[PDB]
Amino acid sequence: LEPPPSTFQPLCHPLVEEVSKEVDGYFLQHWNFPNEKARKKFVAAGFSRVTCLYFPKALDDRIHFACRLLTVLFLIDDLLEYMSFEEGSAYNEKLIPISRGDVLPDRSIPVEYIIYDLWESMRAHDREMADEILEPVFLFMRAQTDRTRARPMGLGGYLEYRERDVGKELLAALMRFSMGLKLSPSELQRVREIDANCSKHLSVVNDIYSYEKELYTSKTAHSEGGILCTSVQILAQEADVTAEAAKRVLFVMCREWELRHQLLVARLSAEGLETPGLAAYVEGLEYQMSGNELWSQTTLRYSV
């Protein structure tokens, strides 16, 4: 799969080696892995590396919080594949009061106390910005087990649902937290179209690279939790082509969304509407798109 040309230069946080060591090391002590094979596969995924490619301009003392959060969410995302929608929903709903800090964790259950301690530490660092990540996380969690996954979707309807299931909004709030980048509600409302476009790119690039893993899961895991819900299958069905052909076509559409991101950013500036915070923010989204792609292309999570 030769990626078509992009004008985006991916960038990686300069503390990625140290933070990956710290965070992988934390999860290897605390998380319950079913065996050695799983522990090695965990390290091979490089979950702190994807984080550092997503947020290459995070503050040095904040990048580790983001790595911890995306790491725990990835581990949960995989666990849900062995569950029904109802089981998965119960699992996620238990973590929500714990994430808010309202209910104490059972210390003999690593997902509970990892989540509790992580969000406590985030609020201890920046309460206001940490709090702004909560509802976006919950929105994503609830999307993950939404029964709409077992209903037929066309490309447009899928992308609208996928914006939640991909965690676009939590990733935006986490990006802002990690950079200490505060935006007003007026600034936030102004970039909604830019956010919705960026979401499509993150989602589809992920779908392209994760298709084989998800196909295998769909054949071996739970009939609900493991269900194949991906633009790759949707376009292959709609257009009657192979999944491989669908990927080639979808990658071209991803470059069209890159072009649209540039035009939308230009138009924001050409109207009177770009602020310094908004420029840092839309540039940050660019890094999410290119970093997501660079990680997806290199991670053993998708290639083995």
Added chain:
Amino acid sequence: LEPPPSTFQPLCHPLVEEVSKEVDGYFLQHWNFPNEKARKKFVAAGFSRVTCLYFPKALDDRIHFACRLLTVLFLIDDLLEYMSFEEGSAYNEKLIPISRGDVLPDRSIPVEYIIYDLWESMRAHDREMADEILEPVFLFMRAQTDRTRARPMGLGGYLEYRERDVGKELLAALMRFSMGLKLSPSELQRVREIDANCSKHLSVVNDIYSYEKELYTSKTAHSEGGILCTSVQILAQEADVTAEAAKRVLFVMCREWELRHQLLVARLSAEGLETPGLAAYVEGLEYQMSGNELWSQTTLRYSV
């Protein structure tokens, strides 16, 4: 607009100039053109040229029938743009029994006697093969004014409907008639998937090149008859990109359908199922695809 590479090479019927003069001449004599500007525009389109690109291996004494049939269907296709769905349906339905030879034309009305005389002449030349074009033409005519054009469609639903509106089956029956190429019902069943894939390519290539013409019609002609119904607009809507971006993505998808055509034909041959008639037929479909594209790239119908 740079077409991506293709391995399909077009061919044009050897008698295209002399047949074009004969057929343009008959319509210029008989058809009620409104004025000299319309007469010039009609010649500029090159309707016999597209027919000769579609069917370059037509028998020399049958190609003119195909040029006449396609030429009258094009003229009607443009007339319907100024009509409501109801008016268009009434207009087409009156021609259906006339096409069958079951109802005599009003000789004061050119479309009726042109349609009647043409089909009588094709039945006189080859009764059985002419009769085989009838229902495919009527299926196409009925699709042209179907209210489903005025309702939302996804990419898959559009391609399914568009197979009828683009005349895929009538073009197949006409190709066979023009070549005297007789296929059994079993042979035809073997290439159903190849026909379906070919329809998508003809449809989408037409959609890409005829977009600017159709956009202009949609804004100036009848709100129903002229309604925009095209993969360019549907993909743009599904993905939230411009029309020009959608055309880029669609062209790549068209090359995927070419690859699929080649794989399906290879499989048919490998399984020992490619009869000499089927080999002629599938090569014929390839000329429709490449011929349609070369004409679409060059006709004044789409560039002015």
